[PDB]
Amino acid sequence: ALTKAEIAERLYEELGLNKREAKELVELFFEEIRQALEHNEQVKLSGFGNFDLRDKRQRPGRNPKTGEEIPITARRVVTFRPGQKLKARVEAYAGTKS
DNA sequence: AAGCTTCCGACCCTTTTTTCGGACGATTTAAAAAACCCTTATAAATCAGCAAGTTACGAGACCTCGAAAAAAGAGGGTTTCTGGCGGGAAAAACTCAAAAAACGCTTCGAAATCAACCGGTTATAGGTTTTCGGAGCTA
């Protein structure tokens, strides 16, 4: 996978900023994004998809391997909407399903 | 013959060196004064241990003044440590702008989903061991 260690490496390589502080830079950006959504502060991005929080309603659930049914409680969960610029970048590649 | 300049003699005054005289000290010599010796039988001192009464010399204490040593106070200076202010460069906010990029309209039909539980994936927090950089060092 792509890893924030690999971001720290890329940031050293391409910008030249030392990896020690680069790792803290990425992890702080990755922490403040969490702080925003944790506060229910919708995070809104352009040139990139963005971060919404959806209040899901009561839904039927199951044990898929037994067929037992369990209710799914209403909940607020984060939902990220890819943008058309990102979709256009991602639409086609390689030759196998993902 | 006259004027200028330079020696020379006469003198005036004070300081520096030498000589002489006088005074004082020290030593020597002589003269004067105090003292020593020789005659004494009789009177007074010698002394033995201890008691009873007294004190001349020593010790303790304090004062007094003066001086000496130490401590403090003063002044001269140099070295350095810090603070304030001023100046140039970089950063980042501030101002100005375009071009994307998102959002909405607006989706009926296609995913997304959660739930519990198994096995499996793997990013990486954390720790462990080690090159690179710099310490300067030395002429």
Which residue do the tokens 């984060």 mark?
A78
In the complex, which nucleotide's C1' lies nearest to the CA atom of residue A83?
B102
Conformation bin of residue A48: beta by default, left when phi > 0, alpha when psi is -120 to 50: beta
Q: Containing domain of residue A36, as a range?
A: 1-98
Which residue do the tokens 């979709």 mark?
A87
The H-or-E segment that residue A48 falls in is none
Distance CA A7, CA A37 (A): 22
The total number of structural domains in chain A stands at 1
Whole-number Å distance, CA A7 to C1' B131? 24
In the complex, which nucleotide's C1' lies nearest to the CA atom of residue A81?
B102
Q: What is the distance, to the nearest Å, from the Cα of residue A51 to the centroid of all Cα atoms in its chain? A: 8
Whole-number Å distance, CA A34 to C1' B58? 107
The H-or-E segment that residue A59 falls in is strand A59-62
Strands A59-62 and A69-72: antiparallel
DSSP-derived 3-state class of residue A52:
strand
Distance CA A28, CA A21 (A): 10
Tell me the structure's resolution in angstroms, rounded to a single decimal.
Answer: 3.5
